[PDB]
């Protein structure tokens with residue numbers, strides 16, 4: 246099956262249009278790249294901002310809201326009939342430092358006095374409510390799907406002990422959802438998003454958290470499974486079990502940030518795209534085959550599958566593509582083998598179904614067919 250230009254390959258979204266939307270994460274510069282634009286128009290019917298809707302991009306100083314970049318994505322989506330997801334109202338990263346300062350400018354996490362700690366909690370929660378309000382009041386009629394909180398459960402299966410949690414305890418999560426619902430109404434859909442959702446003890450900790458929140462009347466419509474995965478991990482069976490366990494709580498499931506890295510963890514990357522052996526693309530294609538068969542099997546539980554980029558020329562996974570060199574300067578990709586140095590974030594991953602030259606990969610063929 247040939248490596249043809251994607252720009253006129255059969256449309257991915259159309260393949261899946263009765264099963265779930267097909268989405269891409271974008272940067273605003275990509276809406277000014279002719280190829281990226283034609284890719285979005287051709288293959289995708291949902292869109293999300295990779296970065297420009299995060300807390301630090303939207304409100305970098307208190308009272309200073311930049312919606313200009315966010316607005317461009319929204320405008321594009323509307324003109325092209327795409328669904329929109331908002332990523333994300335609350336996170337422990339890419340979040341402005343000002344939220345967590347007390348009235349004297351000291352970090353709130355330092356405060357020892359209990360009455361002052363409680364005052365800081367209430368102040369933080371007010372600021373959270375104001376951030377959410379201002380965003381949802383602007384976008385509630387345009388944006389259907391909302392990542393209300395991102396990564397709030399730890400890999401150890403405890404709540405992530407971020408400043409949100411250290412300052413305000415569990416109530417930051419409830420307040421975020423209640424605020425979104427209050428200002429956005431009943432027709433926006435609210436998600437908790439996280440990675441390694443298939444993995445214990447994180448998975449059951451997420452499940453117990455959400456079950457309790459819903460029992461307490463916190464409005465949560467779904468779970469976002471970030472799905473930053475590898476060729477051989479996590480298994481499809483464990484993916485299935487995960488999706489099924491949340492759908493049994495009455496939750497929608499979205500595959501929100503899918504990419505299938507060529508590498509393991511921590512990754513030992515190739516230094517360039519050209520160095521990645523052909524067999525890796527085949528192994529990837531077979532993984533994508535199995536994965537999409539599974540998502541189809543579960544399509545009544547999955548409303549969207551979004552890729553965390555458009556094509557292999559641009560992926561956040563390059564920032565993790567560490568390149569290991571042996572004493573003779575040769576590249577090392579065997580996870581156990583000797584090496585002398587590492588160049589962090591200097592290599593190349595290849596996670597999508599579309600190549601860096603915008604031509605279709607074997608993974609594309611594997612998911613566009615009906616086998």
Ligand SMILES: O[C@@H]1[C@@H](O)[C@H](O[C@@H]2CO[C@@H](O[C@@H]3CO[C@@H](O[C@@H]4CO[C@@H](O[C@@H]5CO[C@@H](O[C@@H]6CO[C@@H](O)[C@H](O)[C@H]6O)[C@H](O)[C@H]5O)[C@H](O)[C@H]4O)[C@H](O)[C@H]3O)[C@H](O)[C@H]2O)OC[C@H]1O
Pocket residue numbers: 295296395440441471473478502509510561
């Ligand atoms: O073998 C397993 C092993 O596999 C297992 O799991 C590891 C556990 O850790 C996982 O790592 C996670 C993956 O999820 C990450 O967060 C997601 C993804 O990234 C976010 O978007 C990116 C945010 O950063 C952006 O770059 C910014 C842009 O602006 C600049 O000004 C700024 O300076 C720059 O840094 C980038 O563009 C953007 O795409 C997304 O919002 C977020 O929600 C998380 O950070 C990371 O820790 C790993 O995936 C697993 O393999 O552990 C157990 C073993 O058994």
Ligand SMILES: [Cl-]
Pocket residue numbers: 295559560561562
């Ligand atoms: Cl990126």
Ligand SMILES: [Cl-]
Pocket residue numbers: 600601602
């Ligand atoms: Cl290529």
Ligand SMILES: [Zn+2]
Pocket residue numbers: 256258259286287288289290
């Ligand atoms: Zn379309």
Ligand SMILES: [Zn+2]
Pocket residue numbers: 517518519
């Ligand atoms: Zn090259």
Ligand SMILES: [Zn+2]
Pocket residue numbers: 263264265544545546547548549
């Ligand atoms: Zn569906």
Ligand SMILES: [Zn+2]
Pocket residue numbers: 272295559560561
């Ligand atoms: Zn990017």
Ligand SMILES: [Zn+2]
Pocket residue numbers: 248600602604
């Ligand atoms: Zn090519």
Ligand SMILES: [Zn+2]
Pocket residue numbers: 534610611612613614615616
């Ligand atoms: Zn297939």
